[PDB]
């Protein structure tokens, strides 16, 4: 037909125009801006340097340390989140007592603000004040070290952001008819042999969408490191590096170059997860 | 092999399958039949170890098995919703139990091929269970069950999700298969057509208490209860109350002089004074086509045919006589599903009657096998 | 009902370390202007390089609600060369310069003018001191080696063993290292900040390696603070307040902090709330604000516990050269009305309100006519040391790129527990030089 | 039985403790008196309310709550309207390239904030729009539309449009039918999608931290991230925990009240 | 009221309702029965105005209607999936086509109460159709369909989603209900049982084109096609191939020379070369019980019964043959769904036959109800 299709275009034009006029124009601007020597203190002289604002970022120490830190946090946090969220989903889906209290307890760390969660984890791991650092040996302070500080950031991120992954995995899992498990149980599989040959290959799209969401949302963390470590000890992730280089040095050429490079990193991740491993849309 | 059980029960936090006992022989085809709500699906599950039996024995072979998980007994249940994995291929479905049972993969291929050759899905061993029709879907289910050569092959109303036409062919196919393989089988069902078509015995349950074990012929032509006389219905039985003439029985629209034999079987075993007579729809005919019985040696009457259906070699003639037929042991639950309305009677006349919807009729009843009953106990009085 | 219209309000930005002693001054001067205008008081973070972040984020992205700002002493060059912080010779009247140059101390005032003309009028002149508990140790260290010796002696005895020095990846550590580098003889940048001179000459090389050795002796002494690599101006104050430390080097605003925290509970080695004479001293809003007799009785009982002393030198017979702190009031270049803003920066640094700020806010005063008042020399007891520590001072490089240098040479020393006296010197020279040239990424 | 019941009791208690122990640390720290906060006692002996009696004295944590609520409501209204107009066309209409629009939306819902804040801070949306409400409503809409599209498409595909035919069997008036048979069916899905969008557009820190200066247009996450303490010469742990607890509750109550809707909306209506 | 249509059609980017012509009067109860995917539901919609007429007229009593609205076309459909609004209450669900018709509230109350009293859901008038069961939900749907008292009343398989047993009760309900109200009806279904029970005429449709119109008896006992006689009569009437022997017809088990009467009646037209012969299962009577003159003229034969089934009033025996009898012009479309088994037939015998599986039976085929057709065009030769 043509009437209904023209009406579809008329109904879709608002959202599409809005989204790619306030998501693609910022990136076109950031590119045109990274091609320049644009300091925010003296903006009267911004000459055009071809690509010496990407070389300066890609051949500098502070860029690769931040990239390594954010990749480490991403992979470790996403793995622990997947495991623990599969556990939470199987508990919220197959429990005999009140499964309303459990959904409530799981929605509490989903609606809370990341800033308050990070303050809780910051005061918990401070010696003297915190109960979680008052049980370590004497004179430890596991928040002024690099690797322990990173472990604590991973723990904060896992706690805060596992319930959303759990709910997505449950959205996938509640589409497993009980009959299938009853048949696998008659077949002689057992509790673990079926979790790997009946229920896991069934929720492949839910697992893949949850992994994509988690990987990107962990690649774009700013506050669990802002108000918990601050970026000291060479801990700050790539978002904190962009924030620092834009607002503490005023160089917006380098700030927008870092913006473009982060966008390309996220694009490569979300292209791997899509062209490889499948992971189509949930509305497919 | 040969599955035995006795004294078995269940308890939900209630007597669900209380007081159950039988010895299903090697090849004997038990049909656990009953109305939705009776303990058929749950006694099946119990046999399949999905719920540990509360009290009693569970002897596949001759030994206690009510402790071993379903992974051990080698039962190979089929399900009503065709539980078959979509993420697999038909051959991988069929070979799932066998690949879990540690079979050599060459023998895997050979045996799955023989199983798919027995059935008629032979070429479908590469598609997925999302591009299949109901017949071959349920056939894939049965094929997955066949392969193990199980010990008590037990089904769970597999033909419930199909249409109302392919079920005939599927009944024939299950019968032919079962007769070829030769394995013990128990078959939860929902109607009487299957329970009378495919079966060596029948177990008519009401809410948990078995009412009769017996071959379909003996379950039909000699019921042991009201429920097992009205549940094997076709045109369900017609439950007229009546009186004790002390020479015969006086119907609401007639009076019989039954016989001396049934008379002494009724009198020598005295009972309270309430007798609900039953006359199956086959025996009722139009007096205009017969002379032997319909005369003085029968009970004729007249009624306006509220509706007549000439649906082939048999004209069903309904009629509604006034009075009462309620107030019995279990006819309340019997009529909860069928025979709605306190008075709605059927008569099966031959395919050459002269009637239409809205004129009188002269119906007679062959007073030879009218099945009297009781009310204070419900038990039949013709035979056990 | 209050979109935007109304009487003039002049947003006055200060660090959060003075959100009460400057709200009190804004309140003392508001009611004096009568009906002309009012002086609000917005605040900035506590970090010394985070308030520059906020202030320049408001200045670059044009924020028409920024009128006066209290900027540090090392930002006048960068805030004047960049166009912000309009000079003092630009009024509808033209007398704020006459007001600024009039009475101030020369030390602080010379840190306001960038080339020859002023760009901000000073309001405060900080200077680090040595605070030590007086019932634990007599005869304070007076030398960093003696300081480390005293810490070790109190650790072997089993008391407060910390040192509570501001070692953290921020401007406070560069202030510390600059004091220790100027005392020994070196200096970060040349006279004109054109070339790095940390490790230029073996004299300067020896000075910087000695400063690094002293930075590493602390923070690796046995019994030292477990978290000394994440402490700052505040946590050292509270460290000595809560009894954990027994020595500390910190700005002179710690005496009223200790007095208030004692008289409202707080410390345990100094009750001051069992005294029935201190009741009703604590102000209603929270500050101390004592009488004369109540301050005498809250100081007589704090003179036998918590004496102070001048900053410990780097050699036995060479006095220390501490660095300048302070605040300079400058009127932003994104204010629609800057005659009233100059009147505000002219009536926030009156002689009165300077007595107030200095006496009961800690922050020293820049007016030379105060240090000779017999009541002031009695209510501000650390007027002595501060004075005799502004003669030989150590002003930071004061160049238009200084914050880049001070954010490279504070990340070359990022965890102070593990530095290398001889390797970190060359790492520092390379870092500082690549900051002067302007090429790289800020950590 | 008793074994499985005991195991499930243990698992439920463990999940509840795991999910509540870092929220009852903020509270137990905000109720601890200043003279003894430096005690690792997870249970606050000798509580006192002198840390909440000093957070509201001065409209610094209330105006931020008002700004966050207003921004959330306005971006929720706009995102719901436009995403509904665009998610009714991907749940009922058949136009070419509709399995791509949902994918692109859900992909650019994971856009990183940093790559957006360097150009925005310079744009026309930084030329007289620095810290106002529109300057924050715009990027919040950027990040909130795809959630609205996804949730409302989940909430539309399930309603039976054969009911519209059943309605048009009586009068056939399409306006009255679509108003009295289709609107009261869809409305709760729209309200749940709005709840979810408002919750998701309430906790962002980077954009509201880089594009907000004055007392107007400064959300709550930024007001607490910049919080230093009530008094200037006393330890700020109790005061910062008090501020965090003040900011957290107005959304914890939300999620607790609307839990049955949220769980079913996030799961595309799978669980009920 | 009086719905007359002719030459209606349809087109799909396909003439789905090509050559449809009928004239339904008042009170009649027309069925539109056909196999799956046929032109039954589409002609129903086309009558209702949901799919416009591609070519033809639809004069529903008053004038041409094919260019009118649903509010004045044939009113009061009742869909299969019971399209009923869940947010409303049963009261509002029933009253919707009334309240939408601006009838005052007191009269609404009275009319909806009496309509819910026609059925048995009056005490359920306050619930919401999310807490209701299939039976009462169907009752709500038909009750909404009733209140209007419209001109004609067109149903769409309302008894397809119900359970296995309630269908017969709801069938009797529909019959009595249309007998009371008296509205012109069309009723689309998928089976011959209902289409014969509740019906005044029958429209068997295959690929869109009608096959035979008329009384259910006129369709069962006088078919004019292979498809009609292989569709009606649920046990598909047996099929055998043969050719004419110039005196009768010949089978591998019987040599049928019926009569010179039907001989000349077949010779009154052109004699085809390929003839197909059909016998109903109900005309095979087991000579062991055929004590009469029909014993000689029975053309009896013998075969081992593969499977017998005594489901009550009649024993159904199965048996197989040899050769090739899969010649089909409509039998292929028939067996696409049901009718599996190239050589597989079934015979009904009285319940006094002592025959079982494994032995020979003398199946008597009394050649008096024989129906023979042409293998080419399937048209009937004996009757019209
Ligand atoms: O006296 C209280 C002040 O302490 C800090 O001020 C110092 O901060 C930097 C060192 O961390 C120095 O550069 C600065 O010159 C000092 O004044 C604090 O930052 C200020 O807010 C206080 O007023």
PDB file of N, CA and C in Angstrom, chain E residues 59 125 169 214 246 256 282 312:
ATOM      1  N   UNK E  59     -27.688  -7.350  -1.631  1.00  0.00           N
ATOM      2  CA  UNK E  59     -28.923  -6.742  -1.153  1.00  0.00           C
ATOM      3  C   UNK E  59     -29.405  -7.442   0.110  1.00  0.00           C
ATOM      4  N   UNK E 125     -23.059 -10.580  36.093  1.00  0.00           N
ATOM      5  CA  UNK E 125     -23.121  -9.300  35.392  1.00  0.00           C
ATOM      6  C   UNK E 125     -22.193  -8.249  35.961  1.00  0.00           C
ATOM      7  N   UNK E 169     -23.284 -29.002  24.278  1.00  0.00           N
ATOM      8  CA  UNK E 169     -24.243 -28.225  25.051  1.00  0.00           C
ATOM      9  C   UNK E 169     -24.434 -26.843  24.448  1.00  0.00           C
ATOM     10  N   UNK E 214     -28.569 -27.165   0.175  1.00  0.00           N
ATOM     11  CA  UNK E 214     -29.804 -27.829   0.539  1.00  0.00           C
ATOM     12  C   UNK E 214     -29.815 -28.453   1.918  1.00  0.00           C
ATOM     13  N   UNK E 246     -19.869 -53.549 -18.722  1.00  0.00           N
ATOM     14  CA  UNK E 246     -20.999 -53.539 -19.650  1.00  0.00           C
ATOM     15  C   UNK E 246     -22.250 -54.171 -19.055  1.00  0.00           C
ATOM     16  N   UNK E 256     -20.471 -56.461  -8.764  1.00  0.00           N
ATOM     17  CA  UNK E 256     -21.730 -55.773  -8.507  1.00  0.00           C
ATOM     18  C   UNK E 256     -22.470 -55.602  -9.826  1.00  0.00           C
ATOM     19  N   UNK E 282     -21.685 -47.465   7.094  1.00  0.00           N
ATOM     20  CA  UNK E 282     -22.892 -47.944   7.755  1.00  0.00           C
ATOM     21  C   UNK E 282     -23.689 -48.916   6.921  1.00  0.00           C
ATOM     22  N   UNK E 312     -19.363 -48.766  21.974  1.00  0.00           N
ATOM     23  CA  UNK E 312     -20.742 -48.713  22.413  1.00  0.00           C
ATOM     24  C   UNK E 312     -21.756 -49.309  21.459  1.00  0.00           C
TER      25      UNK E 312
END
